[PDB]
Design a protein around this ligand. Structure first.
Ligand SMILES: *[C@H](O)[C@H](C[C@@H]1CCNC1=O)NC(=O)[C@H](CC(C)C)NC(=O)OC[C@@H]1CCC(=O)N1CC1CCCCC1
Ligand SMILES: *[C@H](O)[C@H](C[C@@H]1CCNC1=O)NC(=O)[C@H](CC(C)C)NC(=O)OC[C@@H]1CCC(=O)N1CC1CCCCC1
Lengths: 302, 302
C-alpha cells in the first residue's frame, strides 16, 4: 500500500517571475528581484583568485553601480548597492511588476521549504528539502546555482527563507537567510569548515509514524509509553533532536487515537532495529516529512 | 556523503497559467486550457449516483454548451464539447494568451515526469514521479485533484503526458494520456479493478548505481559481468523489467569506466541482499531515478 506521501514542492511560478541574472566582472549567478531591490550572494564581487579569504568590505567599497549587471530572461540598471551579511542589496531603477506579497523569515531545523534551482537567472528545477539539524540541506546544486532561493507559502504570501551559497564537503548544502546570516556556523569563504553532526528530527519521525498509522500500518504501536522528557534525555545520547510537540502533531494524535508518548516509545525500539519488518516500505526511520506534510497530503488539512 | 540526487520537478509556472476549473452540474475538477481547448476528465459529466457504471456516450449526448462552466482564478464561455477516450475536449471562445509551446506525448514505464496537483483550478503543489511498470504512479492526490496534469519539458516545449483520473486500491494513481487512453488497462469507472504487478525498473536501478559510483560509492562493483540477454531472462523471473540500454546510460558508462554488464551483475547479487551495507544511504535497490536524472543533477548534462 502506497502512503500517498511524496516530496511536495510549492508551485514555483510566483518565484520564477522574480529571478534575474546578476553579473559582476567575471562572476555570474542568480538574484531575487523584489520591488526595486535585487538580492544575491555577495561572493559575486569576488575575483576567482580570492574566494578562499576575501575582503568583502574592501570589495564592496571597490564596487560602483556600473559594476553590477542585472538581466531577466529585460535589463535592469543599478542605482544602488549595499551589503547585509553574506548578501548583496542591489537597488535597481525598475520595480518588479510581478512582485508577489512576500515576507522574509528564517527556517528552523526540521521544517521544510521549497527550492527553485536556477542557473544564469533561468529557473531549471524545483524541489523541497528539510532544514537539517546541523543547518544544512540535502539539495541538488551545481556550479552557478548560487542565488537560488528557498521559500515557504502561507496563503498568497511567500516567505523567503534561503538563498543558496555553498556545498559542504559531504555533498550537502547551506545558504543564508535574507537578513544576511548564513544558516548554522558556516561562512561564505572557500576554505574547509567544520560541519556539525546531523541528527534525526524527532518531530518528523513522529509525523512519519502517524502517516503509517494513517495508512493502516501500525504493528509498531504498543501500549508502552515514553514521556517527552524521558525521550529527550534519550535523544541527546542517540543523535535525535529533542521532541517539541506542536498543534499539527496534536492533530495527528487526535485523528488516530495514538498518543505521542506511544510513538516516542516506538522510535526508541525502532532505533534498535526494524527486525526485518517495514514501515511505508522503509527499513529505516524517516525524518524528511513534517507534520504539516502529513496533515496536508493525507488529510487535506493545510 | 550526500548523493546530490533529489526528486527534481520542472518549474511549474508555465503550466499553472493553463489550469482552470471545469464544473458540470454537481461535479467540479480541473481542466487544462491550451489555445481554444480545455481538456478535463470525462467523469465530470457523471452524476454521483452513476460513477460505478456510467454511460459516457449518453451523458455526452445529454450535455449542451451551457452545461459546462469554465473558470480561471476570468470565466470562459463554452462553444463546443467533444469526447476523446476518457477525456473531454471543451471548446471555449477565448484562446489562452499564456499558452506555451506544447506537444502531447505518452510516457513509457520507467520515465519520469512532473505533476502539478491542483484543486478547483488552483495549483496546490508540484512533484515528480516515475511511470511504474504496471502503468501506475506513486503520487499524492486527494478528492478533487482530477484534472491535475503531468508533463515533461524539452527546451521551451512542454510535453503533456498525464491527466489524473483515479486512485487504485493500493493508494497508487493512474490517469490518461491526452489521446484519451488510460495508462495501462484501467477504466474511469468506480468499480474494483485488477492491478498488474509492479516491477523494479532495471534501467533506473542501473542509473542509481552509476550515481553511487559518481559519488565514490562503488564497493558493489566487481569485475564479474552479466550479459543484457542473461540479465533479461533473469529479470522475467524476479519482478525486474528487462533492461534496454540508452544513450544516457551509455553516457554514464563512459564517464565512470564501469560497464552496464558489471552493474547488471551487481543488481543480481544486491537483489539477494545488501549484507548490511548501504548504497547512497539506502539498504534496498532504488528505481525512482532515471538516467536523465543522474545525468542532469550530478553531471549538468541535460
Ligand atoms: C555558487 O554558485 C557555488 C555553488 C556550489 C557549486 C558546487 N555546488 C554548489 O552548490 N558556491 C561555491 O562555489 C562556494 C563559493 C564560496 C565563495 C562560498 N564555494 C564552495 O561551495 O566551495 C566548496 C565549499 C567551500 C567551503 C566548504 O566546506 N566547501 C567544500 C570544501 C571541501 C574541502 C576543500 C575546501 C572546500
Ligand atoms: C477525481 O478527482 C478523483 C481523484 C481521486 C480521489 C481520491 N484520490 C484520487 O486521486 N477520482 C475518483 O474519485 C475516481 C472517479 C471514477 C469515475 C474513475 N474514482 C476513484 O478513484 O475511486 C476509487 C477507484 C475506482 C476504481 C478503483 O480501483 N478504485 C479503488 C477501489 C477500491 C475498492 C472499492 C472500489 C474502488
Amino acid at each position: 500500500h502506497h502512503s500517498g506521501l511524496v516530496k511536495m514542492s510549492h508551485p514555483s511560478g510566483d518565484v520564477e517571475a522574480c529571478m534575474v541574472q546578476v553579473t559582476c566582472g567575471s562572476m555570474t549567478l542568480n538574484g531575487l528581484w523584489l520591488d526595486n531591490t535585487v538580492w544575491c550572494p555577495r561572493h559575486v564581487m569576488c575575483p576567482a583568485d580570492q574566494l578562499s579569504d576575501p575582503n568583502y568590505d574592501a570589495l564592496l567599497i571597490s564596487m560602483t553601480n556600473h559594476s553590477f549587471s542585472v538581466q531577466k530572461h529585460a535589463n535592469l540598471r543599478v542605482v544602488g548597492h549595499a551589503m547585509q551579511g553574506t548578501l548583496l542589496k542591489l537597488t535597481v531603477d525598475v520595480a518588479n511588476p510581478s512582485t508577489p506579497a512576500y515576507t522574509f523569515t528564517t527556517v528552523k531545523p526540521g521544517a521544510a521549504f521549497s527550492v527553485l534551482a536556477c542557473y544564469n537567472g533561468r529557473p531549471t528545477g524545483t524541489f523541497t528539502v528539510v532544514m537539517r539539524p546541523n543547518y544544512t540541506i540535502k539539495g541538488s546544486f551545481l556550479c552557478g546555482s548560487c542565488g537560488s532561493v528557498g521559500y515557504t507559502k502561507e496563503g498568497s504570501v511567500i516567505n523567503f527563507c534561503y538563498m543558496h551559497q555553498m556545498e559542504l564537503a559531504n555533498g550537502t548544502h547551506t545558504g543564508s537567510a535574507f537578513d544576511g546570516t548564513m544558516y548554522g556556523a558556516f561562512m561564505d569563504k572557500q576554505v574547509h569548515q567544520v560541519q556539525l553532526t546531523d541528527k534525526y528530527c524527532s518531530v518528523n519521525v513522529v509525523a512519519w509514524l502517524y502517516a503509517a498509522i494513517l495508512n493502516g500500518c501500525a504493528w509498531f504501536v504498543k501500549p508502552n509509553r515514553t514521556s517527552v522528557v524521558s525521550f529527550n534525555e534519550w535523544a541527546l545520547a542517540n543523535q535525535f533532536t529533542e521532541f517539541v510537540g506542536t498543534q499539527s502533531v496534536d492533530m495527528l494524535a487526535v485523528k488516530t487515537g495514538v498518543a505521542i508518548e506511544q510513538l516516542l516509545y516506538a522510535i526508541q525500539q525502532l532505533y534498535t532495529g526494524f527486525q526485518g519488518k517495514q514501515i511505508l516500505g522503509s527499513t529505516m526511520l524517516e525524518d524528511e516529512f513534517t507534520p504539516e506534510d502529513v496533515n496536508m497530503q493525507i488529510m487535506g488539512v493545510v
